[PDB]
């Protein structure tokens, strides 16, 4: 009944010191409200600092705010709507859509922060997802119930792989995907918007499934931090209700951690549980344990851990890397070199990969495929030294099987249309697995250099040489 409101007294840094009235002290993490001439000002309470004054670092611009403006609590934590109504929309951290796409009324707008699954609600399984890219179709399965990480600096564009994975999975997904744009560059935001809308994934008028929510990177840090909280809440709702294997992609968990540290420093708290961050433990663990597997179903996550250019020192990056199960490494150097997938089947990994978990043949070929590429990596140094002669008949076969297979590792993307110009490829697991084996098996060992590279499946590597051989004759 009674609308609890207080007097926002002090604005320091990007934080507004929201005092309150007797019994009106809002709880920490509760959704406040601040109506401003520019619109709605979003402030999330912080450490309730006594003196009936609960601190708050706002989710909107600190500008224009006038001391003593009344702020009335929303009665609970920060909220964004939950449900299929969110599909096709760009949900902001405050929750006001920034696309001017009108309010897609949903069943509920749940509070962002909540409980995680109990150990009686946390299950585990060994499942592989059809990622459509032969790199992730062979060298590292993606988990239908387990985290799937990634790496690669600027220019490796792992977000492109993310969109491609979303599209391919949705193309055969019984449940709706999800994303979370943790502080992406705005232009990359619009380009992601265009590519997601036109790919058919974001059906502007239809029934889309990949609800992209972006933190927008251009706000005070609190919104950026809580954005992933919002996205996890949304995916939790989707798994809880639709009960289908609901994907989960996080834009830049490294940017999420930068935002968390920026929040901690922005808050009065002393950041020291990492050496530069005290909250890193709690927040990172909460976000990761939000991705949970239940007896009802699994909500598979896919977080992108940007590599701060070989930041082996950072404790938080090591916590993230040893916070998951399977990953793919997409380097821009010596991995994007002549590769549209831009991945490194060597440095990749898949804990779910067992002959009894990934297919008996798939492990047999991958073992050779990993070894041959490692041998190709092993023969990478020798061939350039004295020439391509030193290899034995089996070795030169490997050099002629792998250097084409490593070239064949590439694949144009169904979403990378705007740049490369090659129409995309989306073979399956039963396709890619036997595809690489036949490449290993030499049944098409006569194919040209670029014949299986930047191609589709094995049956699709036949035409590439055949149509290109027309120019020679």
């Amino acid at each position: 009944s009674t609308p609890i409101t207080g007097k926002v007294t002090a604005v320091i840094g990007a934080i507004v010191d929201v005092h309150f009235e007797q019994s009106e002290l809002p709880a920490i993490l509760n959704a406040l409200e601040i109506k401003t001439p520019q619109g709605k000002l979003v402030l999330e309470v912080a450490q309730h600092l006594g003196e009936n004054t609960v601190r708050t670092i706002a989710m909107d611009g600190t500008e224009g705010l006038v001391r003593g403006e009344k702020v009335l609590d929303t009665g609970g934590p920060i909220s964004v709507p939950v449900g299929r109504e969110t599909l096709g929309r760009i949900i902001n951290v405050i929750g006001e859509p920034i696309d001017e796409r009108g309010p897609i009324k949903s069943k509920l707008r749940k509070p962002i922060h909540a409980d995680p699954p109990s150990f009686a609600e946390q299950s585990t399984s060994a499942e592989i997802l059809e990622t459509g890219i032969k790199v992730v179709d062979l060298l590292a399965p993606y988990a239908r119930g387990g985290k799937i990480g990634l790496f690669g600096g600027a220019g490796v564009g792992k977000t492109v792989f993310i969109q491609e994975l979303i599209n391919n999975i949705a193309k055969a997904h019984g449940g709706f995907s999800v994303f979370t744009g943790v502080g992406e560059r705005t232009r990359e935001g619009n380009d992601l918007y265009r590519e997601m809308k036109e790919t058919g994934v974001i059906n502007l008028e239809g029934e889309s499934k990949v609800a992209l929510v972006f933190g927008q990177m251009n706000e005070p840090p609190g919104a950026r931090a809580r954005v992933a909280l919002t996205g996890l809440t949304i995916a939790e709702y989707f798994r809880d209700e639709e009960g289908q294997d609901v994907l989960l992609f996080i834009d830049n968990i490294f940017r999420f951690t930068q935002a968390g540290s920026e929040v901690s420093a922005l808050l009065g708290r002393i950041p020291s549980a990492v050496g530069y961050q005290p909250t890193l433990a709690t927040d990172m663990g909460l976000l990761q344990e939000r991705i949970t597997t239940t007896k009802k179903g699994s909500v598979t996550s896919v977080q992108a851990v940007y590599v701060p250019a070989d930041d082996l020192t950072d404790p938080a990056p090591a916590t993230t890397f040893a916070h998951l199960d399977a990953t793919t490494v997409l380097s821009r150097g010596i991995s994007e070199l002549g590769i549209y997938p831009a991945v490194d089947p060597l440095d990749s990994k898949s804990r779910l990969l067992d002959a009894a978990v990934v297919g008996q043949e798939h492990y047999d070929v991958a073992s050779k495929v990993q070894e041959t590429l490692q041998t190709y990596k092993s023969l990478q140094d020798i061939i350039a030294i004295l020439g391509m002669d030193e290899l034995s008949e089996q070795d030169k076969l490997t050099v002629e099987r792998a250097r084409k297979i490593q070239r064949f590792l590439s694949q144009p993307f169904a979403v990378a249309e705007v740049f490369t110009g090659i129409p995309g490829k989306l073979v399956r697991l039963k396709d890619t697995v036997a595809s690489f084996k036949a490449v290993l098996e030499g049944k098409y060992d006569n194919i040209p250099e670029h014949a299986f590279y930047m191609v589709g499946g094995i049956e699709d590597v036949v035409a590439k040489a055949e149509k290109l051989a027309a120019e020679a004759n």
Binding site: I270, P271, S272, G275, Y276, T313, P315
Partner: protein, 54 residues
């Protein structure tokens, strides 16, 4: 004599580069020590600065 000399220079490619490989190992150990110490000290100084601010 030519066979012995080719064998001996191949040795010089396994007994002079071997010394160079030893030099590289020693330099790499020293540099790895310096970099591991520098990273740790940087993190420690960061923690000290952050607390001394607080």
């Amino acid at each position: 004599a030519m066979a012995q000399g080719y064998a001996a220079e191949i040795s010089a490619r396994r007994n002079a580069m071997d010394n160079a490989s030893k030099n590289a190992g020693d330099m790499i150990n020293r540099y790895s020590i310096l970099y591991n110490r520098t990273r740790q000290a940087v993190i420690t100084n960061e923690l000290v600065d952050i607390i001394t601010g607080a």
